[PDB]
Amino acid sequence: HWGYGKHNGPEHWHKDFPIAKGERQSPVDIDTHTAKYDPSLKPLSVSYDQATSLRILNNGHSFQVTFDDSQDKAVLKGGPLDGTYRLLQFHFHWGSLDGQGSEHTVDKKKYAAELHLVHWNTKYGDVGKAVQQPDGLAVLGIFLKVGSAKPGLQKVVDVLDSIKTEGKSADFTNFDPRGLLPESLDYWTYPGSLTTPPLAECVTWIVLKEPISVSSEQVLKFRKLNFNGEGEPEELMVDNWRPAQPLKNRQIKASFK
Numbered sequence: 576h577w578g579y580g581k582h583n584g585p586e587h588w589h590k591d592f593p594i595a596k597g598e599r600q601s602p603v604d605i606d607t608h609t610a611k612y613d614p615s616l617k618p619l620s621v622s623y624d625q626a627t628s629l630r631i632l633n634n635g636h637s638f639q640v641t642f643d644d645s646q647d648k649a650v651l652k653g654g655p656l657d658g659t660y661r662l663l664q665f666h667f668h669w670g671s672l673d674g675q676g677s678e679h680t681v682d683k684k685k686y687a688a689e690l691h692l693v694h695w696n697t698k699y700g701d702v703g704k705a706v707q708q709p710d711g712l713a714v715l716g717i718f719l720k721v722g723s724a725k726p727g728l729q730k731v732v733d734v735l736d737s738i739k740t741e742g743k744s745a746d747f748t749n750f751d752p753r754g755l756l757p758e759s760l761d762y763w764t765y766p767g768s769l770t771t772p773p774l775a776e777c778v779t780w781i782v783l784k785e786p787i788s789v790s791s792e793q794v795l796k797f798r799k800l801n802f803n804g805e806g807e808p809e810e811l812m813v814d815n816w817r818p819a820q821p822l823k824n825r826q827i828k829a830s831f832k
């Protein structure tokens with residue numbers, strides 16, 4: 576009923592999810608010359624030392640690594656946020672070729688991929704309640720460019736052969752998501768939405784300025800995953816990105832000059 580193909584892709588999503596044409600949809604193009612430096616924005620606090628990864632799963636739209644969010648173990652605070660947001664999962668969006676794959680763009684530039692670390696506001700008790708609130712989630716977005724390998728991604732890439740098709744999962748304990756972060760935490764921020772159905776308008780977006788570099792071999796492994804289930808016609812999981820949506824009545828703020 577929804578995907579990234581011609582007949583069920585982003586241009587169709589509004590029929591089942593009318594909020595797709597809403598006032599705070601994501602992703603957006605980040606126009607760097609219109610984003611305003613906000614000296615009131617605090618440094619982002621990423622506290623991932625006690626993260627407990629659980630599983631890696633092909634859900635037919637991406638692959639995701641899930642975390643134990645039943646306690647304040649891996650949390651995001653600070654930056655534009657009030658209160659504490661627990662890490663639930665990370666996943667990626669990527670392209671069929673290196674010149675596309677990201678969801679956010681920077682002055683219309685598309686990156687080869689984009690990493691989303693999804694966190695929810697503990698004031699609302701569980702993620703299902705958080706997605707119904709305008710400040711319920713915080714998603715840390717990180718761009719990927721192709722160049723050198725990212726050592727902290729290799730443990731992910733090497734297990735993808737075991738979750739090739741929709742529905743497959745595997746144990747993925749003791750994975751440290753700090754290994755996926757760039758050096759700088761300079762960021763842009765704006766209020767937006769989930770980028771997949773149900774497209775709920777519950778996200779404070781925090782998009783890092785500095786991309787991470789991954790190797791061509793690493794992204795090639797992303798592109799060997801399948802959207803389909805085992806035994807169905809093979810359709811490579813590539814181009815699983817929603818394009819930029821209208822900014823409408825929103826301001827993007829920068830944490831840096």
Ligand SMILES: O=C1NS(=O)(=O)c2cc(-n3cc(CCO[C@H]4O[C@@H](CO)[C@@H](O)[C@H](O)[C@@H]4O)nn3)ccc21
Binds near residue numbers: 641663703770
């Ligand atoms: O593709 C995307 N770009 S995204 O960052 O906007 C983004 C955000 C999301 N979210 C959806 C939800 C609602 C609960 O669902 C979650 O239920 C948990 C168990 O409680 C997890 O087991 C499970 O992983 C799942 O995520 N929260 N975030 C999904 C896709 C995307």
Ligand SMILES: O=C1NS(=O)(=O)c2cc(-n3cc(CCO[C@H]4O[C@@H](CO)[C@@H](O)[C@H](O)[C@@H]4O)nn3)ccc21
Binds near residue numbers: 825826
């Ligand atoms: O003194 C200040 N420092 S400030 O930068 O914090 C600041 C911000 C503001 N505003 C922020 C907004 C919400 C976004 O709407 C904005 O985006 C445009 C394109 O999106 C149009 O919708 C509209 O023209 C608009 O510019 N409205 N006003 C006013 C004064 C000051």
Ligand SMILES: [Zn+2]
Binds near residue numbers: 576577
């Ligand atoms: Zn469906």
Ligand SMILES: [Zn+2]
Binds near residue numbers: 667668691
């Ligand atoms: Zn995402």
